[PDB]
Amino acid sequence: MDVFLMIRRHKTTIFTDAKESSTVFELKRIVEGILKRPPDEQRLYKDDQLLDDGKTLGECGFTSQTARPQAPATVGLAFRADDTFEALCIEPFSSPPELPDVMKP
Template identity: 50%
Template sequence: MDLFFEIQRKKTHIFCDAKDSSTVLELKKVIEGILKIPTGEQTLKKQADDQAKTWETLDDAKSLSDCGFSTLNAKAQHPAVVALCLVKDGQAEDVMIDPLSTPPPLPDVMRAQEGGQGSDSGTN
């Protein structure tokens, strides 16, 4: 299955997709191809808890599905957020994400798709 990601660092936001069987290292290789940052200098993190805003480091050897990503939380219309942190002197920097502008509302067609997932598709 295809999973969709928004990889964020400061004002850089990269949208990409990957198979659920792909590893975190393969996702890093996609980033390397775009930003020219070697995989060894990258650390990828996902939010561990929405309330506390804590981040957990993703293991390069694990598949994306083993890291908790699925078609339910990594959709094309709502990609999973992954933070990119650079490694300097063996230490990964803190998560730094600058917000972008607010996107326009979803079209009715996409809202209908999310309606089956328990969203607010009944409101206009």
């Protein structure tokens, strides 16, 4: 059972999928392949909750209903900047303009 994710740090967004049964640690190995930082230099977050390496994505609240291809769930990523971790920081996306008059009910 696949979950669809945006792994987000600063102005970086990774689009990937993983099994509900796959672990936080295994998702860090996916991130290591792309961004070249090992798991022990990564923190992954659901909102402000730090995720334990042992837990499955399903146990963290990433399900096929809440993590769809067309509406993926966000995983926050922070790197270990020294002996300590940087603060979790995700730059927001831009905002659409006001809805034009002809597109209102």
